[PDB]
Amino acid sequence: ATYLIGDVHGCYDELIALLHKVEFTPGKDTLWLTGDLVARGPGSLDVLRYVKSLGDSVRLVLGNHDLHLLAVFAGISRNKPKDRLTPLLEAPDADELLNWLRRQPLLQIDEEKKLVMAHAGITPQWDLQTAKECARDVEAVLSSDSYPFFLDAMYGDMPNNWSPELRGLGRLRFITNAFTRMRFCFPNGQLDMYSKESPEEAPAPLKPWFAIPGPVAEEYSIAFGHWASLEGKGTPEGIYALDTGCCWGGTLTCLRWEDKQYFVQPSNR
Ligand SMILES: [Mn+2]
Ligand SMILES: [Mn+2]
């Protein structure tokens, strides 16, 4: 079976309880995770140890909090106490865990399922070939010995409009924001990097990225996490918003792909 779970955010106990509910069995089943494995919840260390141990039985994409953790580890960014990352950062296997994390994808594609997953979704300004090329480019910098330089460059809100002519810092920053920070778009597809509200509460003319027809979403289903104020609802057919805010006192959501059946684990906090 194929299971897709939204943002875990250190909620190890809820993750394991949900996997036990569906009797997740590596070797018979595969788990897809939308990223943001870490921060806010108490168990980021246990989450990373477990997910790394799954190997080929898990298909992860990196989220914005996973990248922030890497930046803290590399000394690029300051540790925020509310993220509760210190047990992971101080663990004796922190190097092993975080060198594994930075080699994971930003984009997962399964052609037989016609299924795409990224942390924030797929901007409507991208076709599939462009999304693949951009994912490959940023995965290459994150997996290289020089990844702290890119982590430092990644911060920023501009440019917010895609062009194949984009180069350099702006190109990488756009790619990172599209895959890991996107929520709202302007009508032409341009990213808005400020509004984090639910679609009903957003100022006009902002609309969800998935409300703008794009070439990937016309051919593939898209699963994503990230947008907790969406509460996993309000999406079109073929769009699966899996982040139901477990670390915020909401729920952890698991979707089984074969029958589109949902399973929910209440937050323990
Ligand atoms: Mn998140
Ligand atoms: Mn996120």
Side-chain angles (χ1 to χ4, degrees), residues 1-77 79-81 83-171 173-196 198-199 201-206 208-217 219-269:
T2 311
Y3 295 101
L4 301 96
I5 290 178
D7 296 21
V8 170
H9 277 302
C11 294
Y12 175 78
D13 291 333
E14 289 94 335
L15 173 62
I16 294 307
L18 189 49
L19 290 170
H20 286 179
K21 190 174 280 203
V22 302
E23 303 197 351
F24 174 67
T25 307
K28 313 163 161 178
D29 304 322
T30 298
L31 172 64
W32 295 43
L33 285 163
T34 57
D36 277 2
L37 293 184
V38 302
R40 312 193 172 111
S44 298
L45 172 57
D46 293 329
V47 170
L48 285 205
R49 287 181 170 156
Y50 172 60
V51 173
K52 179 170 179 285
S53 77
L54 288 179
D56 296 329
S57 298
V58 69
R59 296 184 67 166
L60 175 70
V61 295
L62 297 178
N64 50 314
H65 287 264
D66 305 317
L67 296 184
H68 175 73
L69 164 69
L70 291 167
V72 173
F73 168 72
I76 297 303
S77 297
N79 193 27
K80 304 180 183 72
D83 286 338
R84 294 192 158 86
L85 299 175
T86 295
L88 170 55
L89 292 162
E90 291 187 341
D93 49 344
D95 291 357
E96 175 173 29
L97 294 171
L98 299 189
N99 284 322
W100 166 87
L101 182 68
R102 73 196 179 78
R103 293 177 168 64
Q104 299 310 305
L106 281 282
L107 173 71
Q108 295 277 358
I109 298 165
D110 189 314
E111 290 289 348
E112 289 64 52
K113 300 179 179 56
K114 288 310 271 212
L115 171 60
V116 167
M117 171 182 74
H119 181 63
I122 303 295
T123 166
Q125 301 193 310
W126 279 350
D127 62 8
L128 191 74
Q129 180 60 25
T130 300
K132 288 150 109 183
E133 278 166 2
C134 293
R136 156 208 91 219
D137 289 348
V138 174
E139 291 161 13
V141 305
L142 283 166
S143 302
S144 79
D145 288 341
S146 311
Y147 77 94
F149 301 133
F150 153 83
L151 290 171
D152 193 29
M154 90 173 168
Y155 289 97
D157 295 337
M158 290 303 285
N160 52 18
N161 198 70
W162 175 249
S163 166
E165 300 338 316
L166 285 177
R167 293 283 186 278
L169 295 167
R171 186 182 185 97
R173 291 167 179 158
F174 177 89
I175 290 169
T176 302
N177 285 344
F179 276 129
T180 71
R181 288 176 69 204
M182 188 171 56
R183 288 180 182 79
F184 290 99
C185 292
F186 293 87
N188 63 345
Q190 144 180 336
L191 302 182
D192 179 279
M193 281 286 111
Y194 304 108
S195 180
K196 308 190 173 177
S198 70
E201 307 203 326
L206 295 189
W209 64 268
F210 51 74
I212 302 202
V216 174
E219 196 188 337
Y220 294 79
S221 294
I222 301 167
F224 70 108
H226 183 60
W227 193 342
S229 64
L230 197 60
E231 318 185 344
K233 43 203 209 146
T235 58
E237 205 68 23
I239 299 291
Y240 300 89
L242 299 175
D243 181 11
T244 49
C246 186
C247 68
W248 298 110
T251 58
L252 192 65
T253 292
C254 172
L255 171 66
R256 179 161 62 207
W257 192 250
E258 287 72 39
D259 51 355
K260 307 298 186 291
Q261 186 172 344
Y262 291 85
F263 305 83
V264 177
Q265 185 66 34
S267 173
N268 284 330
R269 88 89 155 171

